[PDB]
Amino acid sequence: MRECISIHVGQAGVQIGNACWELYCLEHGIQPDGQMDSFNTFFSETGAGKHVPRAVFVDLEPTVVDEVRTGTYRQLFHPEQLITGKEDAANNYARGHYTIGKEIVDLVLDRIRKLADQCTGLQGFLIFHSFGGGTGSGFTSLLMERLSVDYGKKSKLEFAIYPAPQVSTAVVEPYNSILTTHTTLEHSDCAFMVDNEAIYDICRRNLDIERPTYTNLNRLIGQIVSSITASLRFDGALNVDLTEFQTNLVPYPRIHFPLVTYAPVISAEKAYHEQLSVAEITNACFEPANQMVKCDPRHGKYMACCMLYRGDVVPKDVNAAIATIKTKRTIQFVDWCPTGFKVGINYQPPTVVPGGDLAKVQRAVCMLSNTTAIAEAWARLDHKFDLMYAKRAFVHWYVGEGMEEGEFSEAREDLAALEKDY
Amino acid sequence: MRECISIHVGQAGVQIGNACWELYCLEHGIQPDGQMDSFNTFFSETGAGKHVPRAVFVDLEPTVVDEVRTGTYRQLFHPEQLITGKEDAANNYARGHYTIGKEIVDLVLDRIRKLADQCTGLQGFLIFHSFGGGTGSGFTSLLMERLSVDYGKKSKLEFAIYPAPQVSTAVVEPYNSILTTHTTLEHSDCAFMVDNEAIYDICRRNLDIERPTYTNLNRLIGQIVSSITASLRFDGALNVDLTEFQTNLVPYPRIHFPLVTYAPVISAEKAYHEQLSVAEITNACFEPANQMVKCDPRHGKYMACCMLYRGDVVPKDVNAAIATIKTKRTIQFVDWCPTGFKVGINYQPPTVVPGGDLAKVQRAVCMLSNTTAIAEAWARLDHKFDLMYAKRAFVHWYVGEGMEEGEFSEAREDLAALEKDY
Amino acid sequence: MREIVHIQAGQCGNQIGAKFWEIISDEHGIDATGAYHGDSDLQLERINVYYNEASGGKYVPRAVLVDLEPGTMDSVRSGPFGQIFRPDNFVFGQSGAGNNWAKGHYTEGAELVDSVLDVVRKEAESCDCLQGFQLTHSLGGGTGSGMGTLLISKIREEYPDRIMNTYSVVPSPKVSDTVVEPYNATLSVHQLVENTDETYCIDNEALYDICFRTLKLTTPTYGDLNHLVSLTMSGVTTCLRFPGQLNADLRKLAVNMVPFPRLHFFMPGFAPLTSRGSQQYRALTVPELTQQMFDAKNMMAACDPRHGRYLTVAAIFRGRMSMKEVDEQMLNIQNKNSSYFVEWIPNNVKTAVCDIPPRGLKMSATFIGNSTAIQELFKRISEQFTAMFRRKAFLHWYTGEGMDEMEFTEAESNMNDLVSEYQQYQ
Ligand SMILES: Nc1nc2c(ncn2[C@@H]2O[C@H](COP(=O)(O)OP(=O)(O)OP(=O)(O)O)[C@@H](O)[C@H]2O)c(=O)[nH]1
Ligand SMILES: Nc1nc2c(ncn2[C@@H]2O[C@H](COP(=O)(O)OP(=O)(O)OP(=O)(O)O)[C@@H](O)[C@H]2O)c(=O)[nH]1
Ligand SMILES: Nc1nc2c(ncn2[C@@H]2O[C@H](COP(=O)(O)OP(=O)(O)OP(O)(O)=S)[C@@H](O)[C@H]2O)c(=O)[nH]1
Missing domain, CATH: 3.30.1330.20 (Tubulin/FtsZ, C-terminal domain)
Structure with a gap:
């Protein structure tokens, strides 16, 4: 026995946390109130037939928190773990990092500290947020360094909604993205991808949902986190811990930004049309378009590859499929990283939702790597930042939060050094 | 056995001395009259159950002295240690330095000399005053050089109320500030910060006192001096003397202006909301906004850092917290000063007042350093002096006290040389 | 939550604000009296942004009506949905600036500034959190521009952190309805570059031509203009008022639209x-x-x-x-x-x-x-101002209210700098 803590900041973070808790509740049979020992990794035993999520819901705006506290799962969540803000940063990293974040970071730090107090087997921290959101950038970053300074070497996992190259809710998104990336770089143990446009494209072409909604995105995150945490929440042939995830993909602290991909995303009518075998599902998932990242991995080199099989998957078939994956030349690896393969097998089949896009299947695989194509996105973001900051636009907004342009500039050069480190 | 002498000049100095003596009396259980051996560092044993403060209260105006001699602590203070003036300098350094100060410096010099006569273990001198006040600048400076010439190398500690960049009671404050700084620079062993605006901001945001009063400021000084003098007034694991304070932070006589900060400043209702651990309180105190100085220390380099823990604080936890403070890059130090850390541990918990803003706590830490950000304030003051003296305004007031503009100019260049010495 | 207080200046502004209010009563399911009848919870969940908590299950608009004459006052109150406003929000003058900026800003505005500040402060304090303001007036008119300038100045000196937008009505270039309207636009813009975070410019002839051609109406009227105005109204404020998959507010738009403080x-x-x-x-x-x-x-x-x-x-x-x-x-x-x-x-x-x-x-x-x-509109305004200020015509009306020459000189210099900066961006 062991536990983990999930952190949700901003609208995207709150929605993601709610969806993930919906998964964890329906997978273990939790009714909306909390009733009917691996489920203790995310829920706490007190009283009689009771469980509550080990999470904190915080946002500078109370709209999403109000929406959460109006669902049928009010009884499921403790009221005190929901935090309501008053002044949304409005896509401003500095606003949510200094003006409102500094006076509300205390209660959250403080009581996630108790969440660790009753969880002596705290494996790590889960963070869900968005770069585009000013709250989800600033408050998330500051609480990230607060976690680092209050816990030391404790493992921490970040799930960030990176704005897409052509999808941006706010035009000031480069400022928030660069600022948060420079601020939390040294402490970000592992940060993933989310490309909204790639999610929409995959849903429209794979699930063939011409009119999807953010619920599809919500379980897109939900199924990813479920596949990641199945090892901790269910036994398997070779379970994988959170520590090994950062051990394999962080030989150097500078590069800790791996991309994620799921296989498969198939509707029930199309699930009738295809049953999964290891070779086909892996080679489909390794296909660049199947990746939920809008960056072709074949442009650069591959760091490492991690497989997360769940269900009735034969390890020998895994080895054979992975080998025949290796031999083909569409896949290339760095010279000094010949053997960077870790496989995690779990016996728990992926869980379905009623009325969901995904189809109920006994087996699945999670696609886990850090390709060099992320450098393309980083360079494009840096170029956009240079263009839109060259005339110094929207800077006065961050100035009114009380800093001058210097920190913007050296964050730009820090991220440039990160980009050229490849 | 040993003693120390506290000097109070001007309205601010008199109020500060009164507040500090209130602390020293309530900490040791002194009733307003003086009754019920470490308390002998500030009080003298004569007769039966008697103690009186080892202090001199002097001001060019008798308003504050009259206010002091009308409180319930008339019996506590000897009448003869209160000095009443007749002509306040009215925010004029020259007036209080020549016109009225020169004919009343004699009795005070003279009888603080007896205060040293019966105190053979005189550790040093404590001086409390204000740069903005003409009395607290001129008379304080002249008595400072008189102390230097009548005692030689005796340690002397100065507590000055430096006017804030945007808070100034008098518009002629640059004249008094520059003049006193140039006059007492060579003899000022150690001078601190007081920023009134920073005090108000911290009280309004940390203590959440929307309507504070100068009593909060009075114990802001009172708690600072108590934390400084706890080593002399109470034993500890590693007590620190006044001499070591100037030994560590004055490798060169030019730079002897360290800033001070306390941790924490938390009300009783918020004290219910947070209990102190070493890592969190230190990292909060090192935060620039927690500093009671309106200068961001991250602009420049750090000279040295001194910790003054009081209460049940583990030295091993101190070392671990200080190390993890060192590793993080928000803190930087000069190349030729790698090891500038001194830690003073005391077993006496900080003392509370009834009806006070601070909450009664068994442990506290005092934040003690000399950052380069003081150069920013010095440069801004010099620039304001240049602007408001360029047309030679308010100079005739100092002329009527009988000097020409030259000394103003070379004081300006002396402080410019001090500024560029960084 | 995020309450917004509406202030209307001039006859056109009062009509626009009224029409807005009936449109909001439609959108939120509010009848002519104030009772709620909407068929969905979404209309009435965020009704507090533009309405206040009224007894008897009622709601009243968070509006402030200001004028220097009660003629449009009476027409608006006696018009449709006139009972939804309390009589206190109707504060009016009795002289009328007569399409003069200086009169409405100094002569008659002196005895109305106290009332407008009192009512806006009452609206701000009686609410939970005032997100921002929205004002409607006409720059062609003299009084309405003066009230707009005075209110933006007082808001800036009173609530410097609370942003807003001003829906001013710039006079049509093709028609010179008022001879002294260039002065009105001059002074209004000179105050807007300085007391307003962002401004939407609404020009008459463009909406006139839209109603004529795009809507295919042979008899355009002020009613259609107010209708399209209320559509703009709802379009900007629906993100804050109504739930959205991509939620937004006026602060988001202001951040996304203002690259320089003078470029707004x-x-x-x-x-x-x-x-x-x-x-x-x-x-x-x-x-x-x-x-x-x-x-x-x-x-x-x-x-x-x-x-x-x-x-x-x-x-x-x-x-x-x-x-x-x-x-x-x-x-x-x-x-x-x-x-x-x-x-x-x-x-x-x-x-x-x-x-x-x-x-x-x-x-x-x-x-x-x-x-x-x-930039073209501003440059044409500047050159017109130069044209009839070189002749010093109609200056007596303004100079009789406590005006001065180089004041207008720095006003025209401010528009010159603004147009130069816009051209530099171009
Ligand atoms: N993938 C995904 N992203 C979402 C979803 N909801 C919101 N987002 C992200 O949120 C961004 C919009 O800004 P928010 O993060 O909501 O900002 P906010 O919550 O208003 O916080 P502030 O900007 O500080 O006021 C978009 O760019 C999205 O990337 C969702 O359901 N799915
Ligand atoms: N922090 C703090 N400062 C004070 C307090 N009382 C007075 N001061 C300082 O005193 C200054 C006002 O001038 P004074 O020092 O009182 O001058 P004075 O006592 O009249 O002496 P002269 O100017 O020579 O007449 C202010 O700028 C403050 O900085 C106090 O209670 N707390
Ligand atoms: N779109 C629209 N424009 C209007 C409406 N009413 C008046 N206008 C325009 O506003 C301009 C006049 O502004 P107005 O507010 O009447 O000046 P005023 O200063 O307030 O007039 P007064 O009170 O001193 S008499 C005219 O050009 C007219 O076209 C209206 O209901 N809708």
């Missing part, structure tokens, strides 16, 4: 706008709107953006569609309108969607864009 003038937009025998035949799809987003026909403030360059574009949508179509449409808009767009502001389209469509339309689209086309 934008030109609002609405679509689709089609008649009965075209709507049943037109395509009720996004492309029919994206061909309508960028056009000099359905264009709001009479200066062609094609001559200049767009600064950035904001697009809010209300209906039932997916989001990727919007993103690819915006990308195509860039691809084809690259010359008309700015090269150094990539992806300058601000995309947000409100879930709830307006009453009676399953889409409406509000085009919030900024272009250097307003």
Whole structure:
């Protein structure tokens, strides 16, 4: 026995946390109130037939928190773990990092500290947020360094909604993205991808949902986190811990930004049309378009590859499929990283939702790597930042939060050094 | 056995001395009259159950002295240690330095000399005053050089109320500030910060006192001096003397202006909301906004850092917290000063007042350093002096006290040389 | 939560605010008296932003009515939905500035500033959190511009952190309704460059031509202008008032539209706008709107953006569609309108969607864009001001109210600097 803590900041973070808790509740049979020992990794035993999520819901705006506290799962969540803000940063990293974040970071730090107090087997921290959101950038970053300074070497996992190259809710998104990336770089143990446009494209072409909604995105995150945490929440042939995830993909602290991909995303009518075998599902998932990242991995080199099989998957078939994956030349690896393969097998089949896009299947695989194509996105973001900051636009907004342009500039050069480190 | 002498000049100095003596009396259980051996560092044993403060209260105006001699602590203070003036300098350094100060410096010099006569273990001198006040600048400076010439190398500690960049009671404050700084620079062993605006901001945001009063400021000084003098007034694991304070932070006589900060400043209702651990309180105190100085220390380099823990604080936890403070890059130090850390541990918990803003706590830490950000304030003051003296305004007031503009100019260049010495 | 206080100046401003209020009563399911009858919880969940908690299950608009004459006062109160306003919000003068900025700002504004500040402070304090303000007035009129300037100055000196927008009505270049209206526009803009965070410029002749041609009406009236105004109204404020998959507010738009503090003038937009025998035949799809987003026909403030360059574009949508179509449409808009767009502001389209469509339309689209086309309008205003100030004509009316020469000189210098900066951006 062991536990983990999930952190949700901003609208995207709150929605993601709610969806993930919906998964964890329906997978273990939790009714909306909390009733009917691996489920203790995310829920706490007190009283009689009771469980509550080990999470904190915080946002500078109370709209999403109000929406959460109006669902049928009010009884499921403790009221005190929901935090309501008053002044949304409005896509401003500095606003949510200094003006409102500094006076509300205390209660959250403080009581996630108790969440660790009753969880002596705290494996790590889960963070869900968005770069585009000013709250989800600033408050998330500051609480990230607060976690680092209050816990030391404790493992921490970040799930960030990176704005897409052509999808941006706010035009000031480069400022928030660069600022948060420079601020939390040294402490970000592992940060993933989310490309909204790639999610929409995959849903429209794979699930063939011409009119999807953010619920599809919500379980897109939900199924990813479920596949990641199945090892901790269910036994398997070779379970994988959170520590090994950062051990394999962080030989150097500078590069800790791996991309994620799921296989498969198939509707029930199309699930009738295809049953999964290891070779086909892996080679489909390794296909660049199947990746939920809008960056072709074949442009650069591959760091490492991690497989997360769940269900009735034969390890020998895994080895054979992975080998025949290796031999083909569409896949290339760095010279000094010949053997960077870790496989995690779990016996728990992926869980379905009623009325969901995904189809109920006994087996699945999670696609886990850090390709060099992320450098393309980083360079494009840096170029956009240079263009839109060259005339110094929207800077006065961050100035009114009380800093001058210097920190913007050296964050730009820090991220440039990160980009050229490849 | 040993003693120390506290000097109070001007309205601010008199109020500060009164507040500090209130602390020293309530900490040791002194009733307003003086009754019920470490308390002998500030009080003298004569007769039966008697103690009186080892202090001199002097001001060019008798308003504050009259206010002091009308409180319930008339019996506590000897009448003869209160000095009443007749002509306040009215925010004029020259007036209080020549016109009225020169004919009343004699009795005070003279009888603080007896205060040293019966105190053979005189550790040093404590001086409390204000740069903005003409009395607290001129008379304080002249008595400072008189102390230097009548005692030689005796340690002397100065507590000055430096006017804030945007808070100034008098518009002629640059004249008094520059003049006193140039006059007492060579003899000022150690001078601190007081920023009134920073005090108000911290009280309004940390203590959440929307309507504070100068009593909060009075114990802001009172708690600072108590934390400084706890080593002399109470034993500890590693007590620190006044001499070591100037030994560590004055490798060169030019730079002897360290800033001070306390941790924490938390009300009783918020004290219910947070209990102190070493890592969190230190990292909060090192935060620039927690500093009671309106200068961001991250602009420049750090000279040295001194910790003054009081209460049940583990030295091993101190070392671990200080190390993890060192590793993080928000803190930087000069190349030729790698090891500038001194830690003073005391077993006496900080003392509370009834009806006070601070909450009664068994442990506290005092934040003690000399950052380069003081150069920013010095440069801004010099620039304001240049602007408001360029047309030679308010100079005739100092002329009527009988000097020409030259000394103003070379004081300006002396402080410019001090500024560029960084 | 995020309460917004409405202040209306001038007869046109009062009519516009009233029409807004009936439109909000439609959108939120409020009858002519104030009772709620909406069929969905979404209308009444965020009713507190524009309404207050009234006893007896009622709601009253958070409005402030200001005028120097009670003629339009009585017409508005006796008109439709006049009982939904308490008599206290109606404060009026008795002299009338007579289309004079100086009179309405100093002579008659002296005894109205106290009343307007008292009522706005009452509205601010009686609410939970005032997110911002919205003002409507006409720059062509003299009194309304003076009230606009005075109120923005008092708000800036009282609530410097609370942003707002001003929906001023710039006089039409083609028609000189008032001889001294160039002075009114001069002083109003000189105060707007200084007391307003962002401003939408609404020009008459453009909406007149839209009603004439796009709507195909042979008898355009003030009613249709107020209707389209209320559509702009709802289009901007629906993201805050109604739930959305991409939630937005006035603060988001202000952050996305203001690159420099003096560069804050934008030109609002609405679509689709089609008649009965075209709507049943037109395509009720996004492309029919994206061909309508960028056009000099359905264009709001009479200066062609094609001559200049767009600064950035904001697009809010209300209906039932997916989001990727919007993103690819915006990308195509860039691809084809690259010359008309700015090269150094990539992806300058601000995309947000409100879930709830307006009453009676399953889409409406509000085009919030900024272009250097307003440079032409400002330059023409400046040259007109120079033309009839060189002759020193009609200066006596202003100088009799405590006016001065070089004051107008720095006013015209401020517009000169503004137009020079806009040209430099171009
Ligand atoms: N993938 C995904 N992203 C979402 C979802 N909801 C919101 N987002 C992200 O949120 C961004 C919009 O801004 P928010 O993060 O909501 O900002 P906010 O919550 O208002 O916080 P502030 O900007 O500080 O006021 C978009 O760019 C999305 O990337 C969702 O359901 N799925
Ligand atoms: N922090 C703090 N400062 C004080 C307090 N009381 C007075 N001061 C300082 O005193 C200054 C006002 O001038 P004074 O020092 O009182 O001058 P004075 O006592 O009249 O002496 P002269 O100017 O020579 O007449 C202010 O700028 C404050 O900085 C206090 O209670 N707390
Ligand atoms: N769109 C629209 N414009 C209007 C309406 N009423 C008046 N206007 C325009 O406003 C301009 C006059 O502004 P107005 O507010 O009447 O000046 P005023 O200063 O307030 O007039 P007065 O009170 O001193 S007499 C005219 O050019 C007219 O076209 C209206 O109901 N809708």
